[PDB]
Amino acid sequence: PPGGGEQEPPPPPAPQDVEMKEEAATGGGSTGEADGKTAAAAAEHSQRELDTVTLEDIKEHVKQLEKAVSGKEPRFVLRALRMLPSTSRRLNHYVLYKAVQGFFTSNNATRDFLLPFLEEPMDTEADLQFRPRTGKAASTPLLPEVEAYLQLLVVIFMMNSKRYKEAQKISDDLMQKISTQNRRALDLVAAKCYYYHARVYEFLDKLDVVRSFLHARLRTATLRHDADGQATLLNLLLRNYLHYSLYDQAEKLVSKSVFPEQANNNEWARYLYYTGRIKAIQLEYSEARRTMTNALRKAPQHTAVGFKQTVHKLLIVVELLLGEIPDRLQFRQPSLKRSLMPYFLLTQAVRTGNLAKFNQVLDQFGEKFQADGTYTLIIRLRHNVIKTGVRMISLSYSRISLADIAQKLQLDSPEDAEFIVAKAIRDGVIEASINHEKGYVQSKEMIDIYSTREPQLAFHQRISFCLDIHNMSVKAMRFP
Amino acid sequence: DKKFHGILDQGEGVLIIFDEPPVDKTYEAALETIQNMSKVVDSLYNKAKKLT
């Protein structure tokens, strides 16, 4: 009781200090300015809701003795939130439940008491037509149930809480969704709950009847609103279709839903990456690396970014497949350095011409590549090792025996050492001829490449590109 | 020592002599502008990147 009564009594009110200022300012705003007048294309309540997801990601950790959040639920759920003269008593009810935690004891919600914390939208003239309240009054309890996820006989409490929000989601899909942004501000509440709808299901449940419900969700999308409904319903469509073998990739080629034209700078950034791996996994190399690069330089400024630990790995998988390689550790971190050393040792073998050096990696770190889920692209680098090597040898040696190149590439056979060189010319790596009767492979010396048209093609790509950024500097300037 | 330029042969001693002032003015006096302009964009960080 002294170790309790000095360390337990400040966890109730100082969260009550900041929760009368963040979602009470959201409840004070997004009931009267999302159901109210307007929250326009330049709104604040979405970014305010962006402020009330991230803060509560790392806010709550403990099982909430002293009712420091276990008493917030009997406070924040007895809410009509209809109009100002009936919420002037509710502005007292933000303080009337504070002494319920203090003078008395509330109901400590420890893994059992969430069932009398969900049935309240009948109590004291509550509604569901005001879904700028009730979609947020879903998400204000729907987040902290599932934020820790706590995975011990809880899943049904998360489910029935989603079912009441799914009842709000059907009223979203059918009933009066126009110019109140009832779809728009709840497409985020659709999108943000889907990740809590998935990590439940990616933990212990199925995946696929939600997909047909998501097709029914994609049905009404772009069918009433063409803003942030075309965007988040397609990355959340793709998120396990890539990991499944279902058709889902040539569908997304001819699909019209490729461009929502705006997706709020962070869901748009990874959007070019989930379809960036689709061209990577189905052999479309050169088209992929520009939507892989564009999916990199549109991401914000966080540090614990473990998906960015994957895109920097994957972006130069396909560039090893094309030949080009940048320095990958050019932004090396204390958390990037350990995530590069097996994969950086791979591209060490690619810039060399050795053949079973590839085999000395693929037995040492063959298990690591299957953890990242990338092995099926790794296995085909032996075509690109041998074309790197045959370009390397033919440029160095001019008149080399074909019964010498195989011993240097440890090919163990001169009789197909002619044959890779045949496919080197069929692909077009080296030009010159082979004296198959003698055995030497002669190469012609290069000639005046300066007086060829091809450096103008190095220019014309970049003349037209540099006039574009001068035009974009004009088009983005005179907003005043 | 580059006081004269040419080539020497080892088999029979043939001195293939050639000359051209190739070009120097056009490229490297335009190349150093690029690294001057790189430092200008670096100095844009001290009035834009810090500021807005």
Partner: peptide, 30 residues
Amino acid sequence: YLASLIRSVVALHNLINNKIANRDAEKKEG
């Protein structure tokens, strides 16, 4: 190619010359 490269940098320095006159007056004037 050099002269067009200069054209992009100059208008970019002009771009900050409008971002100095956009943000530094909305708090001042309103």
